[PDB]
Write a protein that binds this ligand. Sequence first.
Ligand code: SF4
Lengths: 100, 66, 212, 101, 335, 191, 148, 111
Amino acid sequence: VFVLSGYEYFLGFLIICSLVPVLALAASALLRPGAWIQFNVRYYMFALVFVIFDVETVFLYPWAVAFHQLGLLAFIEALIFIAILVVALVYAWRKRALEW
Amino acid sequence: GVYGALAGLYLLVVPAIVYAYLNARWYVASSFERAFMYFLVTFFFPGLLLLAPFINFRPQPRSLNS
Amino acid sequence: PAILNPIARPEVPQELAENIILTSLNDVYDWARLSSLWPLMYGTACCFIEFAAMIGSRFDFDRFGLVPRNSPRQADLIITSGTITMKMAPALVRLYEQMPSPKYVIAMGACTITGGMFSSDSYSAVRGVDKLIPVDVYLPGCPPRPEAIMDAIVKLRKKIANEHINERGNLAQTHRLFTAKHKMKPVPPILTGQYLNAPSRQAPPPALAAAM
Amino acid sequence: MQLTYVLILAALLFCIGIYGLVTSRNAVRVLMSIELLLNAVNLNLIGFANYLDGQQIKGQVFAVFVITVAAAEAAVGLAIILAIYRNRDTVDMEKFNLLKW
Amino acid sequence: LWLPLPMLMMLIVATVGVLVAVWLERKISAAVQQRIGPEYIGPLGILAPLADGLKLIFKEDVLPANSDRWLFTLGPAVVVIPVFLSYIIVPFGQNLLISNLAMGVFLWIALSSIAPIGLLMAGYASNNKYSLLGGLRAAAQSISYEIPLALAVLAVAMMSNGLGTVEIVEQQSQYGILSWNVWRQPIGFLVFWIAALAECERLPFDLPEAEEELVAGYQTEYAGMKFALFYLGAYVNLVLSALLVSVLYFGGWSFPIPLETIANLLGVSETNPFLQIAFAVLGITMTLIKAYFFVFLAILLRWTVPRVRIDQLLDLGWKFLLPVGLVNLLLTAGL
Amino acid sequence: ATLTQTITFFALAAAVIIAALGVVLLDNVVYSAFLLGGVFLSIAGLYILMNADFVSAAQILIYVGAVNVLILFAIMLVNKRETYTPVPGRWLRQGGAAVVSLGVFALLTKMILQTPWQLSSVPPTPDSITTIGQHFFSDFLLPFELASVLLLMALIGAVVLARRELVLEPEPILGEEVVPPLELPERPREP
Amino acid sequence: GLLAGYQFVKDLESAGALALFVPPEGGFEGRYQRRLRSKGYTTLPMSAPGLGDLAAYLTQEHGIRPAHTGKEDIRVYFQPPLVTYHLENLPPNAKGLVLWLIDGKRLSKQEFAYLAQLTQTLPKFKVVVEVGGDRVVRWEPLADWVAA
Amino acid sequence: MLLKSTTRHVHIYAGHVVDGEVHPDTETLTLNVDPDNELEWNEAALAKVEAKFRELVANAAGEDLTEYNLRRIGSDLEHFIRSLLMQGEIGYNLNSRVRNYSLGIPRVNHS
Ligand code: SF4
C-alpha cells in the first residue's frame, strides 16, 4: 500500500529533469565540430561543523512542525537541545575551528 | 489551458502593443515610466519572444537637409 | 617557373546543396554565433586601453553582444591587443589552442599586423601575429580608435554569416605528425619559484665584503 | 515489493559492507564500508515500520537516530585518519600493524 | 513524453524564467553604468538570452588533456538537476499546483544540499591546480550558508503549522497584506535573503577572478554545453530562491481586490481587454510579479555591496547568520 | 498503477547494490566516494516507497549533503600520489573475507523467509512528521536529549584530534624525566 | 524580411552587377553570400578602398610595392590580375565567381560604372558592390544606381 | 616541462605524442607541419621537409635542450617551407576559412 499523496508526479519529474542534461548534451553532440594542493585542514574543519549542525536542523523539524499542538513542556525540553548545541557553536569560534 | 481565446490575448495582441510602446518612450521616459517598462517585458516575455525577429528598432534614415 | 607562391586549384567540387529549411536552420546557427561572440580579455601593450575604453560607458562593448570572458575555454573571440614579443609568442598560441573550435581571432593595432614601429629594427618582436595564428579581420591604426574597433567587429559579423554549417570539418586541426630522436644535452631549469628564500641573498659573499 | 524483499535487500547490503570492512586497503574505504552497514540496519528498520506497527511508527523514529549516530561516527571517524596522516604520511591498513603482539 | 500538462507548463516557465533573468541582468547592470545594454539583437536585447545560449551548443565541448572523463561530464549534471527538480514545490496561482507534497520546503533544502558535490566532482575532474583550490572553496561556501537558510524556514514553518507550501501561503491569504510573513518575521527574512543570495548570486562568488586568489574559479576548464549548465543553471536557482522568498514570506498568489484606478501598474481605462488579460494571467501567475522584484533586487544588490573576500565570507555565515538564525527561532517561539 | 511501484522498487534496489559494489570493489577511491552518494540517494528513494517521507528528506540532507561532503573533503586532503600497489602483501586473506560475507548473507536469507512476520493490513503514515514529533517529546525524549550530548562531544573530540598544533609545537612544558609535547609519557622501548 | 528564398541568386545572374544596401552594423549582409555560394558561385570578398585603379587591378597585372622600411630596396611584386587568375583556378563544373566588395561607398562614380560595364564584357563573372546603409537589406542593379 | 616551439606552420615539441596528450621526453622531437591547413600539400613535399627536419635535428645534435634551440630549428623549417612556395612546389589552400596569405602574395616570375 502507498498512502503518500502527491508523489505520482515526482517519479515523472525525476525522469524529465534528468532528460534535460542527457538529451541536451546529446543535442550538442550532433551540432558541434609541481601539482600540489597544500594539506590545509580547514576544508575538513568547515565540513565537520556542518555535519553537527545539519543534524541539529533535522532534529528541530519535527519540533517546529508539531509545535503549536505540543505545549510548553515540549519547549523547555527542546530548549535543552538548542542550548547545549550553542555551547558547541561557541567552542568552534573560540578554538579557531572555523577561522579560515 | 485555453485553446485560442485567452492565449492570443496574452501571446500576440497585447505584446504587439508593448512593442509600439517600447519604440516610442524608452529613452525619453521618466524615472517612473522606466521601472514600469521593465515589468511588462518581464511578464509578456513568452509573448514578446515570438514577435522578436519581425520588428527591427533600427533608426530611420535621415534626410540630409544641409 | 611561372608564378611564385602559386594558388592550389580546388579539385573538390564543393557540392554544398540544401533545401530552404536547412538554410533556414543555418540562419539560426549563423545569427546566434555572430550576435553573441564573447571576447577573451587579452591585452599586452598600449592597444588595451583603446579596447578597455570600449568596455566602459562612452562606447558600449556589450551592445553588439560581446560579453568579455577572462578564460580561453569560455571565450571564442580574441582581439590581439598589443605587441607580441618572442616571449608572449608561445603564451599566445597556447591561448589560441585552448579555445572551442569556432574561434575567429581579429588582429588589432599596427603591431599585430606587421609589427608597426617595431618592424625596422627590433631584435625581439614577432612582426605580425599571422606568423602565429590565423587572423580573420585586420585593423590598422596606432592605436585604433574605440569607434574603429567596433568597426572591425562589424566586419567580423560579415564573416560569421558567410560560414557554412556543413563545412565544419575544416574547423578541426589536422595531424601531419613526424618523430625524430635528438642528441641534445638536457639542462636544468633556470627560473624555479624562489626569490626571497634563495640562499644567495642573506649574506654578502667572501673575498668581496672586505673592501665594501 | 513486499516486506520480504526489503529484508533480503538489507541483508545483501550488509554483506557488501562486511566485505569492504575486511578487504579494503585504504583507510577511508573502510569508513565508507562501515556506512553501508549503518544503512542496512536502516533499510531493515523502516521496512519493519511500514508493514509492522504502521499506525505509530516506532521504526522511523529509530531510523532517525541511526543517521545521527553514523554522521557523528564518521565525523569522529575521519578525524582519526586525519590525525594519522599527519604522523604516518600514508593511509594503508597494512601499515598500521606495529602493535603486533 | 511528458503527457502531464502541468509538468510541461511548468518546464516552460522554468525555461522562460531563465531568459528573463539573463536579460534583466544585462539591462539593469547596464542601466547602473549609464550605457545601453545589448542592442542590435532582437528589438532591444530580447534575443540576447537566446543567442548567448544557442552559441554554447555549437562549440566543441572538448576536454583537457589528463582529466577524468565520467566526472567531467557528470560535473554540471549534479549542480543543475536538484535545482530543476525543486521547482515541483512552488505553487504559483490559486488554481494551479503541480504536486501537493506533504513537505517541500524541507525537500527543497534537502535537494539543495547535493549541489556541493557537483562543485566537487567538477573542481576535481577538470584536473588543474586552480580548480581544486577553487572547487574546495566553492564547495565550502554552500556549506556555510545552508544552516542559516534552513533555520529561516524553521521559523516560518512554526507559524504555518506545516511544511506544505500551499498550507504556508494559505495562512497569508486571510488579510491580503496584513498577514504576509515579512511583517511577523522581519529578522528571519533577511536571514533567508542574505543566505540565498550567498548561494547563487554573483557578488559572493569567486568566478570573476579580478582578485586572483585562483585563476578563474572552478569553471575554468569548462566549455560549450557543459559551461551552459554552469551559466544558464545559475539563474535557475536565482529564480527559484527568489520565488521561495515570494512564496514563504511574501504571500504567493495573495493580494486584495484589484478594482482600482489606473495607477495599479496597468493601462488607463477601468474595464479594457488589456486589463482583463493583465488580471487573468495574474489570476494564473501572481507570484512572478513578486518573484521578479527580488531578481531585480539581487541584480541591483550586486552593484551595491563590495566584493567581500572568502576570509570574511565564511565569517558571515557561521559567525553572524547562524546565531541570528537561532535567536530568531526562539523569538518565533515563546521564550 | 501498482506495477509501477514494483518496477521502481527493483530499479532502486539495483541502484544501491551496483553502487554498493562500487564503493567496495572499485580501484579508485574518489570514484568510490562519489558513488556513495548513489547509495545514499537510491536508499532515500526507497524510503519514499516505504511511506517514510520525512526519513528520506532527512537522509539526503545528512548522508548526501553533510556526510558525503565530509568524505570528499577528507579524500581531497589525502591523495599523496603514492599507492605503491603491493597487492600480494602477505597472503590471500581477501578470499577468507568472501566466505564470511557470503556466509552471513546465506545465513540471513534463511532467517528472513521462514520467519512468520505479523504484517498488518492497516493504512500507515497519518502525516508522519506529526506522529514522529510527538515521539520526540513523549517517549523518545531521553534518546533525543542524549543525541545533543553525543553531538557536542563529537565536536569537542573531532576538533582536538584534527586541528593544527600551531599554538606551541616546540613546548618543553616541565620535567621529572623527559616527555615530548602531545604524546603519552611512556616512551617506546624494546626489551 | 526574415525567411529569404533564392531570389538573390537569380537577381545577380540577371543584372550582372548588384548593389547591396545593408544595415551598417553588418551580420545580415553575409546571409546572401551563402545562398550565392550554395548555388555553385564562388565568392572573392575584396576591399573597395584597397583596390587601386580597377583597370590595373582586376584585368591587368599590377606592381604591388612592398614596404621596404629603409632596410630593403624598392621591390615590385607583379601580382597576376585577380579576376582572370581566380577564374582559371575554378573548374567549369561550377559557375563563375563574384567580387563581394565591402566598404564600397568610397569608390568613385566612374569606378562604379567600370564595375558595371565589365561584368557583361567578362563571361561568368559578377560583382556585388555593397554600398550604403538602410534599415532593411535590399538590392538593385548597379545600372540604376549610377544613374541615381 | 614540455619545451616547444609553436609557430604557425611548425609545432616542434620536445616529447613524443601518445594519442593527443603529449608527454615530455628527453630524446625525441615531434613535429607536425601545418596544423591549420593553409598550404595545400601533396605526396612529395610532405616527405621533402623530412630531408630538412631530420637533417636539422642531426646537424644540431650537439647543443643544449633549450627552447632557444627548438626555436632555432623551427625558424629553419619555416624558411624551408617558404622555399617550397617560391619554387612553386606546393600551393595555398582555398577551402580555408581565412585568406591572409601569410607567406607573401601570389606573384608571377619576372613580370
Ligand atoms: S602599434 Fe603602437 S599603439 Fe598599437 S599596440 Fe603597438 S605600441 Fe601599442
